[PDB]
Amino acid sequence: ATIRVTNLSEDTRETDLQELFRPFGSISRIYLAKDKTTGQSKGFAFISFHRREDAARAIAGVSGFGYDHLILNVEWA
Amino acid sequence: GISRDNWHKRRKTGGKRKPYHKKRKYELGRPAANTKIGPRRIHTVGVRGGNKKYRALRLDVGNFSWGSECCTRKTRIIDVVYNASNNELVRTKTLVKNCIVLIDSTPYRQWYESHYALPLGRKKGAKLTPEEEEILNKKRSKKIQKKYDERKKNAKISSLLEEQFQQGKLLACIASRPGQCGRADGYVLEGKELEFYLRKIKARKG
Amino acid sequence: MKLNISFPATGCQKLIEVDDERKLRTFYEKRMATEVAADALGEEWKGYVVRISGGNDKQG
Amino acid sequence: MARGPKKHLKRVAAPKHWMLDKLTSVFAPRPSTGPHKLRECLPLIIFLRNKLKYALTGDEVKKICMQRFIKIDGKVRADITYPAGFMDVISIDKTGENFRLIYDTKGRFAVHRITPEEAKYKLCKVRKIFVGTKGIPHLVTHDARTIRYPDPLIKMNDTIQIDLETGKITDFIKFDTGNLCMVTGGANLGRIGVITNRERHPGSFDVVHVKDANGNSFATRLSNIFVIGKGNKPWISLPRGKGIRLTIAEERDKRLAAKQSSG
RNA sequence: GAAACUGCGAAUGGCUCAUUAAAUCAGUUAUGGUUCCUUUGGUCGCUCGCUCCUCUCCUACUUGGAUAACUGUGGUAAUUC
RNA sequence: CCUAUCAACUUUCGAUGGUAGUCGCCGUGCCUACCAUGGUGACCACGGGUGACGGGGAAUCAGGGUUCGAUUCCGGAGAGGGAGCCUGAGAAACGGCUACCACAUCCAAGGAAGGCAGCAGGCGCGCAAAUUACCCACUCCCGACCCGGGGAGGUAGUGACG
RNA sequence: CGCUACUACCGAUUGGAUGGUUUAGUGAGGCCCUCGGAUCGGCCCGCCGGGGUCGGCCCACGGCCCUGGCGGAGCGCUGAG
Numbered sequence: 001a002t003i004r005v006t007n008l009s010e011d012t013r014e015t016d017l018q019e020l021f022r023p024f025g026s027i028s029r030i031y032l033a034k035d036k037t038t039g040q041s042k043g044f045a046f047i048s049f050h051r052r053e054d055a056a057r058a059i060a061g062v063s064g065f066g067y068d069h070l071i072l073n074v075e076w077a
Numbered sequence: 078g079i080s081r082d083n084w085h086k087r088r089k090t091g092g093k094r095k096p097y098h099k100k101r102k103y104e105l106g107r108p109a110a111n112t113k114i115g116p117r118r119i120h121t122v123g124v125r126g127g128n129k130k131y132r133a134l135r136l137d138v139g140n141f142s143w144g145s146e147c148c149t150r151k152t153r154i155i156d157v158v159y160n161a162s163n164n165e166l167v168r169t170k171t172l173v174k175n176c177i178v179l180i181d182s183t184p185y186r187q188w189y190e191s192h193y194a195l196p197l198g199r200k201k202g203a204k205l206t207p208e209e210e211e212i213l214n215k216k217r218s219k220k221i222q223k224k225y226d227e228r229k230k231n232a233k234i235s236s237l238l239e240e241q242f243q244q245g246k247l248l249a250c251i252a253s254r255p256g257q258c259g260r261a262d263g264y265v266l267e268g269k270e271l272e273f274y275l276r277k278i279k280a281r282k283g
Numbered sequence: 284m285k286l287n288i289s290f291p292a293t294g295c296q297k298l299i300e301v302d303d304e305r306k307l308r309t310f311y312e313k314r315m316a317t318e319v320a321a322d323a324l325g326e327e328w329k330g331y332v333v334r335i336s337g338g339n340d341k342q343g
Numbered sequence: 344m345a346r347g348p349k350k351h352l353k354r355v356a357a358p359k360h361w362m363l364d365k366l367t368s369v370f371a372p373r374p375s376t377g378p379h380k381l382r383e384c385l386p387l388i389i390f391l392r393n394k395l396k397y398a399l400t401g402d403e404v405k406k407i408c409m410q411r412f413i414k415i416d417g418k419v420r421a422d423i424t425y426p427a428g429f430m431d432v433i434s435i436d437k438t439g440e441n442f443r444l445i446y447d448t449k450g451r452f453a454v455h456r457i458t459p460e461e462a463k464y465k466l467c468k469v470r471k472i473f474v475g476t477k478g479i480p481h482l483v484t485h486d487a488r489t490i491r492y493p494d495p496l497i498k499m500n501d502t503i504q505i506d507l508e509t510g511k512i513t514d515f516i517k518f519d520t521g522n523l524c525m526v527t528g529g530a531n532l533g534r535i536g537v538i539t540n541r542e543r544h545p546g547s548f549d550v551v552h553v554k555d556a557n558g559n560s561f562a563t564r565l566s567n568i569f570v571i572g573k574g575n576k577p578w579i580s581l582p583r584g585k586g587i588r589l590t591i592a593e594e595r596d597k598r599l600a601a602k603q604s605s606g
Numbered sequence: 607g608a609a610a611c612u613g614c615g616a617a618u619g620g621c622u623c624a625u626u627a628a629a630u631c632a633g634u635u636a637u638g639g640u641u642c643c644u645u646u647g648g649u650c651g652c653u654c655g656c657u658c659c660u661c662u663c664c665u666a667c668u669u670g671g672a673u674a675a676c677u678g679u680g681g682u683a684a685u686u687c
Numbered sequence: 688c689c690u691a692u693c694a695a696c697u698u699u700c701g702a703u704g705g706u707a708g709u710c711g712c713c714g715u716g717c718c719u720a721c722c723a724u725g726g727u728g729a730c731c732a733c734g735g736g737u738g739a740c741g742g743g744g745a746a747u748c749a750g751g752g753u754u755c756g757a758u759u760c761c762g763g764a765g766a767g768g769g770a771g772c773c774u775g776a777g778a779a780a781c782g783g784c785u786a787c788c789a790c791a792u793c794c795a796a797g798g799a800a801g802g803c804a805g806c807a808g809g810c811g812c813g814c815a816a817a818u819u820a821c822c823c824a825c826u827c828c829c830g831a832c833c834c835g836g837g838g839a840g841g842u843a844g845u846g847a848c849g
Numbered sequence: 850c851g852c853u854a855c856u857a858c859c860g861a862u863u864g865g866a867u868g869g870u871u872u873a874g875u876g877a878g879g880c881c882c883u884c885g886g887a888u889c890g891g892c893c894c895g896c897c898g899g900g901g902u903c904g905g906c907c908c909a910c911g912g913c914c915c916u917g918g919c920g921g922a923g924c925g926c927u928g929a930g
Contacts, residue, residue, distance in 0.1 A: 024866095032758055050811065052789085053867050061868040078771060078779080078880070081710080081717045084629075090727045091697030092734090098764065099845040102772090102779050106711055106718085108881050126641035127776055134882080162708040163720045173708055225665060256709075287680065296679040316672030316888065342797050344765065345780045346617035351828060351839085356760055366759075369840070370827035376645040399745045401826070426646085481648075489648040510647090513672095545633085615829060617778050619839055623740060623757055623764080627688080627842040631741040640713035643776040672892105683795040686822060769880050786878040 001055040002048050005077040009068050010040040016068075021047060023060025024061055034063070046077060081106040110256025112136050114156065114170050119259045136172060140262035141249050143179050145235070148188060152180040154261060158248070159278050172255045177274050178263070179246040184263070186242050195232040200242045213230050215274030237271055248274060286310075287338065299324075310335060316339075326340075358382055358531075360450050361389055372424045378427035378487040379591065383528070384472075385444060385452050387415075387425040394454055417507030428486060429527060429569065430465045430579075432457070432507070443521040445582050446525065446533030448589065453582035461579055464504045464513060468570045472497060482512075485569075490575075502570045521574040526553055531563050534588050535581070537574055541565070556587050 005017070021027050028050040033042040049055035062074040064065045081104050084097040098147055112133040124130045142149035155232040157178040160166040166173055182200070190196045190212050215221060217219050223228060233239075241247045264273060284307070289296035301307055301324060309323045313335045322326040357363055357371040372386040391407065392398035398407060407413075408421050414434040415425055427433065432443045441462035447453050467484035472493070475481045482493040484503060493503075494515055505515040516522075521537045536555035542547050542562075550562045572578045581587070584594075 027810060056866050083715075087697060087702055089703075090732055091702075095626060095629065097626075100779060109709055114778075124712070126640080128712075175708070268896075289679075294678075298679070314887070339681035341682070343687065345763075346780065348616050348618080348777075353760075368826050372827075378646045402833070409833055487647055491648065613831080617780070618826080620805055625764075627739070684793075685799060
């Protein structure tokens with residue numbers, strides 16, 4: 001499905017997330033909201049998995065898992 | 078759909094088989110005819126490998142054979158008195174192979190009296206009065222002597238047969254599948270078999 | 284709607300546009316076989332008996 | 344799946360004794376349905392353009408057939424992959440040449456010209472002799488030809504001269520000990536010889552002890568023995584390679600001696 | 607001779623090995639337990655006269671009547687509608 | 688093939704058998720009545736696992752063995768997942784159908800049409816794998832047919848698997 | 850006993866996720882089966898056109914019969930539906 005990720009840093013880009021979400025199955029694509037007028041990575045991302053099982057697994061784990069000294073928040077989009 | 082295979086169910090060992098392929102047209106195993114008693118309809122059905130199979134829905138006539146005289150006559154089948162496959166079949170009046178049915182006495186008796194030119198006895202008062210007497214008199218003027226020489230130990234037939242004539246119906250056994258053949262044909266019960274079926278009919282009732 | 288009225292003696296057919304409610308309404312709740320009177324539509328369909336035969340809805 | 348029978352056969356999966364190539368063509372001719380089984384058959388095409396070499400395309404093969412210059416068994420065929428078999432005669436009516444198919448003991452189908460006298464008839468062994476419907480008798484030959492009212496003393500494994508002008512039985516030869524046989528299939532392919540003894544075993548499979556002309560003795564199943572006439576009385580000639588049996592050493596000596604000695 | 611009806615192919619072909627542990631499958635056997643178009647070979651007048659309606663059942667020098675393609679009018683935002 | 692840190696198992700929704708019937712192209716607990724209490728295991732059953740399709744075959748080994756097999760051929764199986772069905776001798780068929788479920792598409796919002804584990808190609812995936820090409824002339828297959836159609840198949844291109 | 854790093858274990862949160870089995874309930878769809886008659890003709894009763902016969906050998910138009918046309922009566926009664 002599509003899952004939303006929030007509480008991203010501006011030092012956390014698509015590439016940093018790409019390796020992070022591989023133990024929860026292979027991502028199809030990682031879209032990340034950027035605005036270059038203010039900041040870099042706004043704070044919201046949308047990761048798109050190919051399969052429904054893989055997507056749900058991510059939401060469960062990643063929520064409570066630390067990455068760059070912040071608690072990532074993941075939830076169904 | 079409705080199914081018929083050996084690659085399902087339990088093993089000898091107490092194991093369980095796991096499928097071989099997915100249901101196929103050959104396995105089809107069509108629902109029952111459920112043919113009973115009422116006005117005749119039969120339908121032609123297209124079945125596997127080509128060929129035509131009759132599906133009977135309602136039958137009420139059969140071709141019942143008198144096996145000790147080697148003649149078969151087409152008669153009514155009015156009811157199921159006994160069936161040994163299931164008791165319910167009798168009650169519901171569903172015709173299946175080996176149903177013990179009731180057929181008319183009168184055509185078999187009429188055939189015998191005419192053919193042998195002497196009556197078995199007297200079936201009934203009503204039966205006697207217009208003809209039976211006619212047959213006894215003979216239409217042979219002339220060739221009376223020929224009949225007497227020809228027929229020895231007649232003016233009678235076997236005890237079991239005579240007893241059934243008195244009842245006004247004869248017990249008969251269905252010797253064909255009424256739902257697949259489309260024929261409810263059978264042979265008239267006689268000797269030991271008739272005695273046994275009457276014993277069963279009496280045993281079950283009451 | 285447009286009535287596709289055919290005279291089958293001549294083998295002809297034509298459309299006509301009738302949007303007048305009274306002229307139409309006569310043919311409503313008729314089923315394909317039933318006769319109707321076409322007198323409603325004018326003098327030129329007066330004395331005509333019409334057998335409804337079919338047609339097409341909206342969305343085809 | 345598999346929802347029905349194949350209508351194709353690949354090459355390099357066809358029977359060896361047809362003498363096709365390996366992988367240089369990806370499809371074999373495949374016999375049509377007919378009187379003989381596809382293993383033992385020889386599609387018309389292989390005979391016509393691979394042995395007698397009258398075509399170098401498939402386009403030509405179809406065009407040849409449509410001329411209808413070819414009769415097979417006295418009857419007029421036009422099938423591109425006709426399922427000819429054992430002692431089936433091919434009749435070219437444009438050249439007056441009659442060829443029959445009989446095994447080499449090498450195991451290769453022989454191109455074996457016969458006279459039009461010997462192409463009048465062929466000897467066919469009875470497969471079943473059948474009391475048919477309404478008490479009319481029939482014999483049925485191996486090549487699935489049913490002849491009604493057959494001679495009233497015949498019994499199983501008899502041979503029967505079938506005639507191809509007019510059909511029907513044109514006498515018969517009775518099955519007896521010491522009859523000529525050609526043993527077909529197996530490890531005894533294309534060998535000719537007498538009988539000697541037929542051993543009978545109740546239940547399936549009965550073996551027939553054969554002795555060949557050389558004096559090599561062997562058994563095979565009755566099924567693999569085909570009766571081709573009366574003992575020491577051929578009705579068609581021996582084919583190339585002896586048709587009896589020859590050793591690989593002898594065969595080498597023939598191959599080198601004949602080659603560069605002709606022309 | 608476009609078309610259309612009719613008949614046949616369309617189950618074959620090609621692809622991939624997920625599934626399944628005596629299941630599949632291999633080799634050896636069976637169908638006397640059964641179905642099979644086609645091809646190849648036989649089987650092609652008749653009711654054996656309803657003790658000839660079939661000499662009157664006298665349509666045999668041959669019966670009955672409807673759809674396509676076609677022609678015309680059309681509907682649908684969009685359909686191999 | 689591996690497993691006892693799987694030792695008892697199979698029928699109340701038949702487990703095995705007798706008898707009789709329904710049903711099926713046809714055998715048969717296939718299904719059902721009635722009637723029996725069977726059937727199977729330390730010679731590993733039963734249960735669990737499995738990148739577990741099977742064979743012909745492949746690689747290395749003195750010999751003995753060990754390892755490999757989706758993959759040019761043969762058999763079986765499936766065509767997004769399930770279930771049902773029509774045609775036909777043969778199909779429970781995705782370049783047929785129908786429903787639902789998961790996916791995707793058009794929409795004027797009423798509706799409507801769909802299945803590349805076919806050939807090319809693209810996306811995703813990864814350490815990993817090619818032309819959106821040309822042709823039915825060959826090789827064969829199909830048809831009413833020599834005549835037509837074929838991503839069957841041939842042909843080139845890509846190609847330091849080797 | 851101490852720095853540092855990895856791993857298995859136990860763990861509040863009756864943490865979360867996914868897949869397969871499960872009682873019971875509900876149950877699409879098709880198939881089978883009991884019905885139904887939306888629908889259309891056919892064979893019979895009016896007028897005619899032809900033929901024919903029992904108005905009429907003027908046996909001819911026509912009535913009447915047959916069949917075609919067309920409507921109506923019972924829509925009677927068979928088949929399809």
